[PDB]
Nucleic acid binder design. Structure first.
Lengths: 113, 136
RNA sequence: CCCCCGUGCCCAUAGCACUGUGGAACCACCCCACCCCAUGCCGAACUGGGUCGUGAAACACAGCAGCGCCAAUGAUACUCGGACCGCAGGGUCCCGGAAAAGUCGGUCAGCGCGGGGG
RNA sequence: UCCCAAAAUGUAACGGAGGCGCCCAAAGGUCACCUCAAGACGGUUGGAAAUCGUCUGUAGAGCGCAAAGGUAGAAGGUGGCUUGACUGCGAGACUGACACGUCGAGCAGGGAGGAAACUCGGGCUUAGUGAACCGGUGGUACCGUGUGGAAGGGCCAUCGAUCAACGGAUAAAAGUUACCCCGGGGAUAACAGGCUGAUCUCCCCCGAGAGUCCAUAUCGGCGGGGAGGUUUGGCACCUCGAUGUCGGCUCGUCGCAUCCUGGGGCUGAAGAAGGUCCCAAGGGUUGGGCUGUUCGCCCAUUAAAGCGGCACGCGAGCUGGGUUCAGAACGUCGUGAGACAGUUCGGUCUCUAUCCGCUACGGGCGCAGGAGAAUUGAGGGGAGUUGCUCCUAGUACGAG
RNA sequence: AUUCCUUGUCGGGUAAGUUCCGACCUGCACGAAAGGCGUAACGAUCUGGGCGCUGUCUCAACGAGGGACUCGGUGAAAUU
RNA sequence: GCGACUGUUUACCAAAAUCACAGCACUCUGCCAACACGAACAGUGGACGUAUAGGGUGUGACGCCUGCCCGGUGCCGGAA
RNA sequence: AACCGAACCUGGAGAUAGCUAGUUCUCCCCGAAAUGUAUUGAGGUACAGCCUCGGAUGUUGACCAUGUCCUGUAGAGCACUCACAAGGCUAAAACCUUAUGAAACUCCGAAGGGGCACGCGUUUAGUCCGGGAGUGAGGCUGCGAGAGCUAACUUCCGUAGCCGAGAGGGAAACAACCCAGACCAUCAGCUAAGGUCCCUAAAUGAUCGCUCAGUGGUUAAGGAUGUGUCGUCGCAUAGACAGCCAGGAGGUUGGCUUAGAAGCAGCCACCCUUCAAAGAGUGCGUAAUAGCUCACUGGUCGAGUGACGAUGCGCCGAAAAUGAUCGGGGCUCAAGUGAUCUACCGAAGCUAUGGAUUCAACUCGCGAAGCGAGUUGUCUG
RNA sequence: GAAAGCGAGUCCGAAUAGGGCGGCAUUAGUACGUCGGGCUAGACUCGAAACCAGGUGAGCUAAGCAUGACCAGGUUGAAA
């Protein structure tokens, strides 16, 4: 059954990450950096990362209840609870790992000029 | 590369070779020296290697298609039922058969062709030539 | 000496398939069929009553090595047992046993009882 | 039912695939009779399949359902009659440890189908099943406690259990314990060790390609060969009549895959500041905020602010912040008691060293007179860090 | 403290805050009499900050007194 | 932050965010009360009380408050 | 009334205790099991398996042969089944050629194995009845498979040996491995394993070579013409590709595509001439050419060289934590190692002299139980 | 044999098939003893946590009740 939730989790997750990763490019007007006008712009970037974190947590606090309250109806025993956790972590941690990595490059451009 | 429809699991055993053929659909060949497990993730891996070296005129008759489905190690406790048969496929290669062979290329484009694609091989291999006749 | 009819052993080193020789005796077709008996529908089969003609066709003998079928010297796989090797995958040495396949070759039969004919 | 095997039998694994807890008023019985799958050429409200027909045809189809064996003289496809899908029985065998279980020639009674020899005691065989007890219902007039019956009992037959955790305790039975208690276990877990090493860490081989040019200055797809064992873990072998668990504070110390220094090579190295790889563990490697942390972020520095061992070094050294006793609270699960690698406030961890080892200090004897006292060095320990600045300089150097 | 998901995200005090106080809201699993939200005074309650002082600390040093050490007297234990 | 407050407790590991409380609420009981102790139509406690009195439950200064859902459960009522 | 999730005291029984611990005199004989089945069973117990005692039997046991039957691990293989390598060919299935895999494919198919009667070299068990048992997870190792990185001094079947309840010697130390199964006594001899420089015995013995690492003392992909030995390609009055000086010629004259890509970023194709002779180009450096070289030529040296292919030995690869080491010392004037031989050493094995014990039969004596005597074996430890 | 009951035979059954037994290699044995063992009792010995019955005391601590005891000093400042 984990092979079913894994997809539904990765698809929806990567679908968002791939989306925001493209939206952040719409913020960059050109060069970025015109006398002090560099940090104030970063404020807009903070929103992209903030909304990203939540989006990655939603799927975790949504797909989990779909299985937790499912294995209680006499269908799936234990030993799968933690198994499902380590499954969403490899997706959540990986996502955040890409976000911070992406922002590291974006910030290097918005401050470059 | 990949199968279409098979059973659940299979077996494993080291037996003698039943195909003492050196030349097959070409001129040169490639024979191993010691038994080894050739993973399906190697055939396609070396395929692109023999393609970037051959310019217009590079055909290969791969007949070492993996037919020995195995299991894969879990990630916690290996206690209970069977394992997952979803990972990779290998094929027992008894020293005496051919895994790689081409035709058309020159000697220099052959002695080095099979030379490059051989480092990822668990065992050592060699090349062959004419003087190979079995049946009609 | 031959040949035909049945019925056996044998159960493709006897089978199929190219072609031929055979109908006098035997053999089949064919003819007819109210009813015995009979077809999911037809008397093609089964079957009752029976010529000539015929023997492409079913049969019967015969030749030809196309294909089937059988198929050994040598030799390798494996190998009881005996003695070892490499971290291992796995591998060898000694004494016997020792087949698949494929090579040569060999065939399309051989052995009876019975009844009918020259 | 196969498969798994040390090849007759047999045989394990929460080992690899699949079926049963029926069905058949008759695919049963007996007797007659019919040559299947499938392709091909040619025709139909057909243009995939079937159907009709003719060739082919070791049967490749079928056999109610699972697989296998069996595979045509038929069990295979039809029809008549029929209902042995029988009572009384079994020589002698298969199989089982026991109780079951399977197969059976021949006997009899009476029947069924062929003309007959004959076949016939369910179904091509293998699953479609359940002891014993307790009770229902037909037949039989063996007991029936003074005799005579009867009640009740016995025997034939048969019915009832989804006893399914199916060789099966009661007619009938769920939870919880962090209030916990007793008997035992390292033939079973968590710490640690160990074996291991998939995962981790790291070294090496191949050269796709980036790198203007160029594969290896650097970086190295795809794939590979080993290493170390500090990580997840697997196995769980000493240790559950007790190997105290994280972390810190204290004390340290050892390895190199060397963070800083130290010498080197290559550079895509002008200098300068680097990279990288090689050699190299003498010595060194800061102070704080947050955190219970190891770990990590940040502040201010530095030659640098290394990685890992040592029972994740160190509690018969300390702390007790963390977690795995009691109370209490919250969310949440639970009808309840209660519950949670969920959080939360609280929470007694044990003056008196034997032996080894260790820091000091003495007492003996020996060192071939008995003394005083001055020394050699076998060997052994300690120490061994580094910045800045100026002098050569603003010189080699470089357009600057 | 209820929010698993990182320290959730801006903000506040700090040189620097996985904490704490304002807020946002996505409350894995707030909430109305297992009461909601709030509240002056009180609490050997818990949490965070500041003032002051300080051997808590950077490092301790010194002094003292009670053992510890030495001789006479009495002389135990767990363990084994 | 928790609780309102003083007060209590886990004599020998936890005094608190426990409990307790003043305050609010649902309900029960007019009889030899509900109720409780009792081998007892004995006795006694509820009370030499008597319903804004008595038991039960929960909740808990004081302040603004106290939503939707009785299907299931239990509770009273009905009744061919 | 100092350990209260139910006080304390006395009795109910010394509750039950399938769990634990302990169980006391000697010698002799035999000698287990950790398997199968069932189990509210899985450290428990039942039945059998295995042990012993004795009564009947008294060769049927046991291995070895022979003939006879049944399997269809190993292998193989295609025309069956599921997958599968290249082309044909057809409107892709099929059919063809070449080529395949396979625990759950199979028309083939062994070894060995199993039932049987039969006997000898053999041989000395076998069984039936009946008394009393214990064991009822077993451990390692090679082999044959599952699991599982064909990872565990991992687990689960089969099988053999050992352990378990067997010492002794060997492997430094070491249930497992190797040699061997210990009746007693012997300052007695021959061997097996394994060894024979010194720490312990026994050739620091022989012959032929391999080695030079100090390998022999935990590894591999992959590298190095390190040395030994086998076998293939071109030449010395062609007086050799490699060493020393010279030439290392031109033309012709478009690509895709650039500011350039008119020898060497990628994608084509790659004639001719003059000659003693010169490329259909194996590099370096530049933005393209220059410039350093390849093949070919002259000369003088030139009885030897250059390319791999196979194995015997070895080097690199090789990084660990309390101090290092093959057991140690050391060992190449080898005490390392491949082959050859012989001698010795060395177990409680075999042997010698003596003795004791268990079972049988053969000469005994006594009227008997019984004793002691000689003989073979045993004395299984 | 289930039993009626019959018997060197008796049950299955209106059949001559088998099971039980007799004859055949023919013990019929019994009582006392010693010794292996089995069963029933403490039943090899030692050890529970716990269960039940009766009894012991609130000179423990928990509380009620009757009756007495005690609270240096200082501060604050209610109603009336």
């Amino acid at each position: 059954m984990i092979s079913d939730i894994r997809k539904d989790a990765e698809v929806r997750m990567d679908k968002c990450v791939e989306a925001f990763k493209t939206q952040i490019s719409k913020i960059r007007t050109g060069g970025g950096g015109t006398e002090e006008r560099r940090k104030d712009l970063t404020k807009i970037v903070r929103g992209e990362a903030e909304q990203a974190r939540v989006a990655v947590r939603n799927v975790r606090r949504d797909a989990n209840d779909k299985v937790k309250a499912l294995l209680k109806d006499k269908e799936i025993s234990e030993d799968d609870d933690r198994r499902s956790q380590d499954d969403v972590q490899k997706l959540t941690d990986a996502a955040i790992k890409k976000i911070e990595a992406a922002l590291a490059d974006k910030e290097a451009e918005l401050m470059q000029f | 590369k990949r199968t279409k429809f098979r059973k659940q699991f299979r077996g494993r055993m080291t037996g003698d070779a039943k195909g003492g053929d050196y030349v097959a659909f070409g001129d040169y060949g490639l024979i191993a020296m010691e038994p080894a497990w050739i993973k399906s993730n190697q055939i396609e891996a070396c395929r692109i290697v023999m393609s970037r070296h051959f310019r217009r005129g590079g055909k290969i008759y791969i007949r070492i298609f993996p037919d020995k489905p195995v299991t894969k190690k879990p990630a916690e406790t290996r206690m209970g039922k069977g394992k997952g048969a979803v990972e990779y496929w290998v094929s027992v290669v008894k020293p005496g058969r051919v895994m790689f062979e081409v035709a058309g290329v020159t000697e220099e484009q052959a002695k080095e062709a099979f030379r490059l694609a051989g480092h990822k091989l668990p065992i050592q291999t060699k090349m062959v030539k004419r003087e190979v006749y079995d049946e009609a």
